[PDB]
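re: that complex we talked abt at group meeting.

here r the seqs, copy pasted straight from the sheet so there may be weird spacing, ignore it
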Amino acid sequence: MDEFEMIKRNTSEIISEEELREVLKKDEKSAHIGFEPSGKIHLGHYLQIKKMIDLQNAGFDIIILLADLTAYLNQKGELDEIRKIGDYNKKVFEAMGLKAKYVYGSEFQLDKDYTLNVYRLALKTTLKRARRSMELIAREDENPKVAEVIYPIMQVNHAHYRGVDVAVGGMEQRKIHMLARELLPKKVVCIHNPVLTGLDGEGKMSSSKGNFIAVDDSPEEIRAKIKKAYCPAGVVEGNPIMEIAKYFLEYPLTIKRPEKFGGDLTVNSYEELESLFKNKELHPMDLKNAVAEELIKILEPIRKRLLEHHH
Amino acid sequence: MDEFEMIKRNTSEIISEEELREVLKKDEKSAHIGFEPSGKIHLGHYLQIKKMIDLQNAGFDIIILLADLTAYLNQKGELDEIRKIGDYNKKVFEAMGLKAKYVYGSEFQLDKDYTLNVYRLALKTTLKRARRSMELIAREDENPKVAEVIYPIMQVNHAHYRGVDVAVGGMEQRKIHMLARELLPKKVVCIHNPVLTGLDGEGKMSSSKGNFIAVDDSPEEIRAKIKKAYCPAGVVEGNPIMEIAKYFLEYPLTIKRPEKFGGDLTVNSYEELESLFKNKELHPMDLKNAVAEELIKILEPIRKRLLEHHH
Ligand SMILES: N[C@@H](Cc1ccc(O)c([N+](=O)[O-])c1)C(=O)O
Ligand SMILES: N[C@@H](Cc1ccc(O)c([N+](=O)[O-])c1)C(=O)O
Ligand SMILES: N[C@@H](Cc1ccc(O)c([N+](=O)[O-])c1)C(=O)O
Ligand SMILES: N[C@@H](Cc1ccc(O)c([N+](=O)[O-])c1)C(=O)O
Ligand code: NA
Ligand code: NA
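got the structure back, here u go
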């Protein structure tokens, strides 16, 4: 497993693998990701931070944007409060083990030169394209605002401003990134991570949809959340519990079961787990129980680092 | 005729007359108008400059924005060239007799605080409202750009930034001004001047439609343009020649005619002219001839001031 395969692990798409290969030959390389500050940091965040750590171990210089200004544009409240959530988010990301350069968008995104560039990009971006690129990002609004279409070109310009080699995001970011790749002189390699299904199975996992597991949830909270989750037997597609097994659990893995249900079961790989589960050889409740306990152990260091701040 | 009536002369609407009355009681009062730089200055410009001179004589401090940045947003070309046209436009406005403070939008519209305000207004302005407000302003584009909707909120913020008492524009500006009146804490009095019909009668007079009389056109040019113009007998509505008689000619006025067509005719007022013309007592060609000669004499000082620069 070389650096390229490590980086590709568990991604949905890399635009493009040949360009990424060229980047990996450089000694000095940069990757960045931006996060609108969020009041709870959940497994979707952690999946992305995990990817930044992968890149960091591949020799990348890592930048994390606390995207306070685009969060303001996306109707998340005042800037001062957004900034305070940003500082909390940074502490969580540090607790996750990421030492990086943390920057607030408003530190530079209001400079004359940045703004002039944003306006130059606004001349090249159609309203229709801008709106399409925000479909999975914009706060729901029956009356969309001008701010919605300024949002994507801020994110495009950021990649230009920083000269970063690689941009990372969830798949929800992919249309903004392909806009960047179309408009900017330097083409950024984009790495997109899968969108986690929320615990209800109804939509995507989000801080605003109340369908997430937070990295600092208590053990009892996690058990309850998993126990209630959508997880139909034989079904992997849109199964949030199977997703968690695929992206966060360490293998080989021992699923503990009562002997009257077959007793303990050791899987050496997610793919092994997947066949057992598709073949209805693994009951949803036994999967839930194992996922819950292993995730508790996975998140424990993060929760304890954050709880030590209170102590 | 007091200051209020002088200011109201030949306007299409004042939003609102009661607010304007309150402004006129102040000793220190400000009015502004903005112009995207234009390669030819025409009678539509002159009508608006005439209104600024009216205000100036009413004791208003006058500001003229050479709107280089919004012109850039509206797809009029580079900024450096736009700025050069702006400087030419200023010289024409001076030749028209307006001594004022001339400012370029880019001198201040890119400052951090200005931009932050623009983004705050973008949170309160719907895309639909922004687009509607640009219907008569935006360059024709089958694929409208994000820049189109940033444009109006720049103009709104400008009024906020300057704290001006009065904003002046053609009626094409009225939806942007009513947006300003809705969003800003200080309500600006808006004075709207009529939109001149182009010489073809087909649409509005514009620098880009080639249907205008420029203030520096030669006498022979003006005669030709007027001679070719739409001017149907008995019709005042959308008659560009009658419009010119109403907004630019001095009364009383002598229309010279051959005796075989009734001989010279003296009208003491546009309204007099209008009845003679509606009653088909005035032939279009005699109207054209008089309009042409009087307009030539009206524009002569402007043309000579500008021609003295070459000399
Ligand atoms: N769109 C990201 C936030 C973001 C990512 C990258 C960026 O460069 C910027 N930005 O420039 O403000 C913002 C989100 O959904 O959380
Ligand atoms: N179309 C997406 C947009 C969206 C998704 C998730 C979110 O958390 C937010 N949000 O915070 O505003 C917005 C949706 O399902 O709503
Ligand atoms: N919309 C005006 C130009 C303009 C008027 C007033 C203004 O404040 C600004 N502006 O702020 O850039 C621009 C035109 O059609 O020519
Ligand atoms: N809808 C208007 C917009 C417009 C009018 C006049 C103009 O000069 C320009 N322009 O310069 O782009 C634009 C039109 O008839 O085209
Ligand atoms: Na080296
Ligand atoms: Na006084």
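couple things i noticed - Chain A has two domains: 3-193, 219-310. The beta strands of chain A are 13-15, 29-35, 60-66, 101-104, 166-170, 189-193, 253-255, 265-267.
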